[PDB]
Design a protein around this ligand. Structure first.
Ligand code: NAD
Ligand code: NAD
Lengths: 329, 329
C-alpha cells in the first residue's frame, strides 16, 4: 500500500494512530524526536509489524528535506507539535517555533518532494471563544492564545499551498480535548476551564488533585451543569485514517472531529467515580461568569463526507481510558 | 551611542535608513545576505562612517544566534524580507519561509539576547481589500495574499512576544508602495493593481513596458482617476528612526506611514512624463472590476504620537526618485 509518514508518531495520539495504521496494508514510517514521545511504545509496536522509525527533529530542516527526498512519501499525517495553552501564554516563541515554523518547512518540503496528501492535526482552539454552543467549521477563526494562533497560522499556510499547487491536498482536523492526554501545565491550575473536565476528574480520581469544583448547576442544560466536548484517543486516531481515505478522490477540506454531542460535568464526575472506584471530593460553586453552558464541535460534516465511525462514544470507557492514562502521566 | 542592527540594510529602504542612522551617534550594524541588496551601496557608505557589516542569512538560525550572543544589540530595525505580492501568489512558501519563519527565529533570538527594541517593517497589505477609502491602524487585518499574510503573522508573534515579555518593545510600521523599489518578478505581471502605478509608470518611461493603462476616468475624484498612496524612500526611512525614538519613552505600538493624502493615476502619469521627458504610451480603458476609487493610509496617528515629519511630499520628487532608481534595478 501507500507510503505514509506519521510525524509525532511516538506521542499519545500519534502512537494510537500508528497502531491502527499497522493493521492496514500501507507502508508506514514514523518521525519523532522523542521529546514527549516514548521509545518503548515504538519498540512494542515494531514487534507487531515492521515500520521505519526516524528519530529526527523537525527543526533540522536539511534533515527533513533529505528524509523526504530519500523516502518519497505519498502522505504525511502531522501530529508533532507543542500542545499546552497555558505554556504558550508564558512562552509564545516556543509555540511559534515548534508548531508554525517547523510545520512551514514541512509543507515546503512536501511540495518539493511530491508529498501531495497532508493530514494536519489542528485544534478547536482555532475558534477561540465561539459565539455559538455548537461550533461548525465555518465559525470565525479567532484564537485567543499563542497555541491557537500557531495552529491557525499553519492552517493558512496549508490553504495557500493548495491554492498555488492544485495537486497538493490537505485535510485539517480540529477537535477539543482528548481523554487521557498528559499535560504538564494542568495540575498547577487550581480552577481550569471546563474543556479540561475529564483531565481534572482523572487527576482527582488518581489522588493528584485534592478537589473538583462544579462552577454552576443551574444552566439551561439537561442536568444544570456545563456541557463540553471530549473524545476517545482511538476515535480521534481513526478519524485521521478516515481523513487520509477521504483525500483519495476528494479535494482539500477541514473537519471538526467529535461525537456531535457533549458530556456534562455531572456525567463525567459520576462516570469517573464509578470507573475508578474513587469517591474524590467535589464541591458546588457559583457560575463562573463568561462560561458558556454548552461548547461542542458540530461533527455533521465529517459524518457526511467520510467513512469515520467512532466506536468509543461511551463515557465510562472514556473516563476509564483517561484514568488509566492519568496514572501513567 | 546605542547599538543598532539593521537587517536588510543593503536593500532599498534599509540602505537609505542606514544612511540616516550614520548621522546619529548610534553604533550601527548591518545584516544582509545580499540576495537582492547591493554590497556596492554598503561600501560607499562604509567610507562615510564606519559600520559593522554581517553578510549573514536569516535562515541560518544558529549563525543568527551566535552573532546576537556576541554583539548584544540594543535594538533592531527589521527590513529583511521578500516583498512581491505577485510572486507570493505563485510561491507562497518562499514568503512564509523568508518572512514569517525567519522573523520568528529573529524574535526568539532577540528575546534570548536582550534586544528589547524591535522596529518591524510591515505593510498596508495587512489590510487586504478595505471597506473604506482611508485605512487607519484599527482597520480590520484581513490580508488576501500570502505576502500580506506572512507579514501579519509576524506582527502577531511580536504582539505575543511583548505580552509575555513586558521588557520587549516593538514598533510596527505599515505603509503602501515606496517609489523607486525594485520588483523584478512583477515586471512579468501584465496588469498590476493601481497601488503599483508609480512603478509601472517608471517602467514605461524607462522603456521596460511598452504601454500603461488608465482603467476608468469617471470616478468621484478630483480628476476622475483612481487615487493611491505613494511615499518617498527617504520619508519612510525617517519614519523608522522616529519609531525607534518613540520606543524610548513609550510602549509598543503600530503606525501607518503616509502623507495623509494620495496621488491620482493621472497626476502620477503626467509627473513621470515631466521628470523623465519620455512621452510613453498611455491607453484609456473602462473601470477595472474590484477597483476602489480611493485607497490611502490614515497617517494622523504617527503625526500626533511621534516626531516624524515628511520632507519630500512632492509628486515630482517622488517620480524623479522612482525614475532614477528604475534604471538601477
Ligand atoms: N487533547 C489533545 O491532546 C489534543 C487536542 C486537540 C489537538 N491536538 C493535536 O494533536 C497532536 C498530538 O497531540 P498529542 O496529545 O499526541 O501530543 P503529544 O505530545 O503526545 O505528541 C506530540 C509528539 O510529537 C513529538 N514532537 C514534538 N516536537 C517535535 C519536533 N520538533 N520534532 C520531532 N518530533 C516532535 C513529541 O515528541 C511527541 O511524541 C498535536 O498536534 C496537537 O496540537 C491534541
Ligand atoms: N518597497 C515597498 O514598496 C514596500 C512597501 C511596504 C513595505 N515594505 C517592506 O520594507 C522592507 C524592505 O523593503 P525594500 O523595498 O527595501 O526591499 P529590498 O528587497 O530592497 O530589501 C530587503 C533586503 O533584505 C535582504 N534579505 C532578504 N532576505 C534575507 C535573508 N533571509 N537574510 C538576510 N538578508 C535578507 C535582501 O538581500 C535585501 O537587501 C520589507 O520588509 C518590505 O516588506 C516595502
Amino acid at each position: 500500500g501507500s507510503k505514509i509518514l506519521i510525524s509525532g508518531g511516538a506521542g499519545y495520539i500519534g502512537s494510537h494512530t500508528l497502531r491502527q495504521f499497522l493493521k492496514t496494508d500501507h507502508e508506514i514510517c514514523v518521525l519523532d524526536n522523542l521529546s514527549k514521545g516514548s521509545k518503548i511504545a515504538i519498540e512494542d509496536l515494531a514487534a507487531t509489524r515492521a515500520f521505519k522509525f526516524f528519530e529526527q527533529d523537525l527543526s533540522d530542516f536539511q534533515g527533513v528535506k533529505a528524509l523526504f527526498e530519500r523516502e518519497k512519501f505519498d502522505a504525511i499525517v502531522h501530529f508533532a507539535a507543542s500542545i499546552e495553552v497555558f505554556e504558550s501564554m508564558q512562552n509564545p516563541l516556543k509555540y511559534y517555533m515548534n508548531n508554525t515554523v517547523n510545520t512551514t518547512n514541512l509543507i515546503e518540503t512536501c511540495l518539493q518532494t511530491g508529498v501531495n496528501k497532508f493530514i494536519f492535526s489542528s485544534t478547536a482552539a482555532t475558534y477561540g471563544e465561539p459565539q455559538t454552543p455548537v461550533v461548525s467549521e465555518t465559525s470565525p477563526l479567532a484564537p485567543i492564545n499563542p497555541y491557537g494562533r500557531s495552529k491557525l497560522m499553519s492552517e493558512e499556510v496549508l490553504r495557500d499551498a493548495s491554492m498555488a499547487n492544485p495537486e497538493f491536498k490537505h485535510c485539517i482536523l480540529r477537535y477539543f480535548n482528548v481523554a487521557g492526554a498528559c499535560m504538564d501545565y494542568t495540575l498547577g491550575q487550581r480552577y481550569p476551564k471546563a474543556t479540561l473536565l475529564i483531565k481534572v476528574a482523572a487527576e482527582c480520581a488518581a489522588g493528584k488533585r485534592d478537589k473538583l469544583f462544579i462552577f454552576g448547576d443551574d444552566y439551561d442544560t439537561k442536568d444544570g451543569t456545563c456541557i463540553r466536548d471530549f473524545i476517545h484517543v482511538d476515535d480521534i486516531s481513526s478519524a485521521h485514517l478516515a481523513a487520509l481515505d477521504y483525500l483519495k478522490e476528494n479535494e482539500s477540506n477541514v473537519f471538526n472531529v467529535g461525537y456531535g454531542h457533549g458530556f456534562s460535568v455531572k456525567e463525567v464526575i459520576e462516570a469517573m467515580k464509578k470507573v475508578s472506584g474513587v469517591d474524590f471530593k467535589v464541591e458546588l460553586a457559583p457560575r463562573r461568569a463568561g462560561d458558556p453552558s454548552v461548547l461542542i464541535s458540530d461533527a455533521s460534516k465529517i459524518r457526511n463526507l467520510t467513512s469515520w465511525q467512532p466506536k468509543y462514544d461511551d463515557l465510562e470507557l472514556i473516563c476509564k481510558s483517561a484514568f488509566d492514562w492519568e496514572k501513567q502521566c
